[PDB]
Amino acid sequence: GSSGSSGMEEVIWEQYTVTLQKDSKRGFGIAVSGGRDNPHFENGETSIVISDVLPGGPADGLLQENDRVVMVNGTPMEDVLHSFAVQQLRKSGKIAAIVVKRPRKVQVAPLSGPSSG
C-alpha cells in the first residue's frame, strides 16, 4: 500500500570512485564491518561499510568511514558476506577501485568568494 504523493527532506546520494594503493602492510589502509548475515549496524543495514580509514595511509583522503560500499573492482558489495567484500581487496594486486556513495542531504548555499586580510 501507498499513502500518496510523498517525498520531502530527501537526500542526494553521490558516488565516489577512488583508487587506493596497497601500502607496505596496511595496503588499502581500510576495514569493513557488517554483512548480509551479520549487519552490526545497530539500525540494520546489510551494506558493507568502511568502519576504518587509515588516517596516515592511502585511504586517508580517498575514502572515508561509513562509505556505503556499492562496487569493488567490478563486484557488487550489496547484500554480500563480510568475507566476500574483503576478498576483492586481497585479490586486487596493488591497485583497487571502490565505488561508495555518500548521503548529500538536499541543501543550498549562497554565493561566496575570497576575503581580505
UniProtKB/Swiss-Prot annotation:
Lineage top rank: taxon: Eukaryota
Span of domain PDZ: 17-104
Localization, UniProt: Cell junction, Adherens junction; Cell membrane; Nucleus; Cell junction, Tight junction
Assembly, per entry: Homodimer. Interacts (via PDZ2 domain) with TJP1/ZO1 (via PDZ2 domain). Interacts with UBN1. Interacts with SCRIB. Interacts with OCLN. Interacts with SAFB in the nucleus. Interacts with USP53 (via the C-terminal region). Interacts with claudins, including CLDN1, CLDN2, CLDN3, CLDN5 and CLDN7. Interacts with CLDN18. Interacts (via N-terminus) with CTNNA1.
Protein family according to the UniProt entry: Belongs to the MAGUK family.
Function summary: Plays a role in tight junctions and adherens junctions. Acts as a positive regulator of RANKL-induced osteoclast differentiation, potentially via mediating downstream transcriptional activity.
UniProt protein name: Tight junction protein 2
Organism of origin: Mus musculus
Protein encoded by which gene: Tjp2
